[PDB]
Write a protein that binds this ligand. Sequence first.
Ligand code: SRM
Ligand code: SF4
Ligand code: NO2
Ligand code: CL
Ligand code: CL
Ligand code: K
Length: 538
Amino acid sequence: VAAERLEPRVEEKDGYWILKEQFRKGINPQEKVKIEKEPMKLFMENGIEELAKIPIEEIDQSKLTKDDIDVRLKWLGLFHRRKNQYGRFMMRLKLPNGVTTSAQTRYLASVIRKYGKEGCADITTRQNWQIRGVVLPDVPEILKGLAEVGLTSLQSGMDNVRNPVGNPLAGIDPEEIVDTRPYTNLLSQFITGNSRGNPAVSNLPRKWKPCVVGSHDLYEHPHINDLAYMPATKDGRFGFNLLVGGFFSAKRCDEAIPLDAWVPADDVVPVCRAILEAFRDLGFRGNRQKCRMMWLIDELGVEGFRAEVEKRMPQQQLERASPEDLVQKQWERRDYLGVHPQKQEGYSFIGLHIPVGRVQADDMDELARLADEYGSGEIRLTVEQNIIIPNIETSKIEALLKEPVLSTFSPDPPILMKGLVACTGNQFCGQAIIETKARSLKITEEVQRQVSLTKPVRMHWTGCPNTCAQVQVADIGFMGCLTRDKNGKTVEGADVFLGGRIGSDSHLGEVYKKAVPCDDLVPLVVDLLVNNFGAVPR
Ligand code: SRM
Ligand code: SF4
Ligand SMILES: O=N[O-]
Ligand SMILES: [Cl-]
Ligand SMILES: [Cl-]
Ligand SMILES: [K+]
């Protein structure tokens, strides 16, 4: 690799970071959008105010403004549902470590309630909230309301740092390694510039996902993150070994690899900055399918990339990885659903199953009420699109278990539901090939009616090859496709994946059977469970 290759490709200009003229040749259309107008201006210069006043039919008549609503607004966490819900926007937060409050939950509920049949909310596979039904004229008021309850939606889509994932049991688990909340909080504050916006990290070549590990269970899925902080002592000091480049895409899935670097705990933000700066400065900006950070690591080599991180550290020093970390390989991932004692004596947390992560406004109000009446007003989201309500006096549990809402959001659902994960799918997502959420519930219900089991089999349903529901981590994964019935008629189908493992001995699953009609999945899955996971016919 030439020294020429290491020339930073972006420069700061008027508070924003833009591609240098000499590196603009051959860029993808999204890069052209970012050059034509800096997306962060919609927030940081209040461009949203004037944009929100223009009727959508008029917005659609010019490239600049159509790109505003279809692309640039994703820097404000707003996602136009052009194909499947025209004129309406999904909105996605920053929610480091999945931690929310009853006040925030009620606020989000009040927004979606306004939109009636066009509104609902979802828990995401990055332990985050999404809301639906948002109309453009309401955006300025929603941004204000979010700020008032201590939320931001900044930089949650497109070429930005995505939600920082942590340990859902942070601070409450007797068995935790390190409380991940301070670190995920610090990362979120850094990424979003304390909710004001941080242009230094908003013009990446592509999305980029961080997590901080605090559990032996590895609830955080470090193996699939662009940066994962693995807790580790080095030379008598607490810090993190760093894994880099993990990602999924339609083209390629790759597990994170060691950077061969360790940082003391206080260097979490400096190293996140250094890595993001290296990626921003040096990343390829052509074919979008070759823009994720792992591709830069492949081009430079891990040592080449490491040197670029090192040069961007304060005092330009980066220690080598510590030989061992604090994560025990001897571990069985713990089921967090149900009632469990906290490390604080006299207190319990409860894990509640949220069927395919979908909630309506009334459901959100009920969950917020439970958190206030029984806990401390806190609600935690998980990457299996479930919830935990922590900080419940254990003496209140008998009463809690009698709450009617717990029949819908159960602390002890059937075992197959506990592990069921499904992406948005074609109810709202324009990329989706099939319907996912309703289908996956119906199929899982019919399968569990036929078999009993004891192994916690994890089933993931994703609507297209983008694999937002991570089918490659599943015991049994289902990827949307169109296929053919016995009469050659078009029907919805799934490619079925097997082999995904999580925790310390992680592994990426692969396609086992292509193009199975959805209507034929029940018998296939019943047999797989009996034949491979010890399930017993009922
Ligand atoms: C909501 C969520 C799935 C869910 O039901 O939980 C989701 C939904 C979408 N993802 Fe994703 N992704 C979600 C996690 C994922 C993950 C899983 C993860 O982060 O662990 C991945 C695979 C892991 C990865 O990227 O490394 C995933 C891979 C993608 C990709 C393909 C990435 C690539 O490099 O090719 C796209 C398309 C793209 O960016 O080009 C995408 C794009 C999309 C969009 C924004 C596409 C669009 O505008 O319609 C989806 C919005 C649909 C909607 O209305 O909800 N989504 N997306 C997740 C939101 C996470 C969050 O809170 O930030
Ligand atoms: S996997 Fe495909 S269908 Fe599902 S939310 Fe992601 S982009 Fe949409
Ligand atoms: O929107 N998930 O990259
Ligand atoms: Cl996006
Ligand atoms: Cl769309
Ligand atoms: K769930």
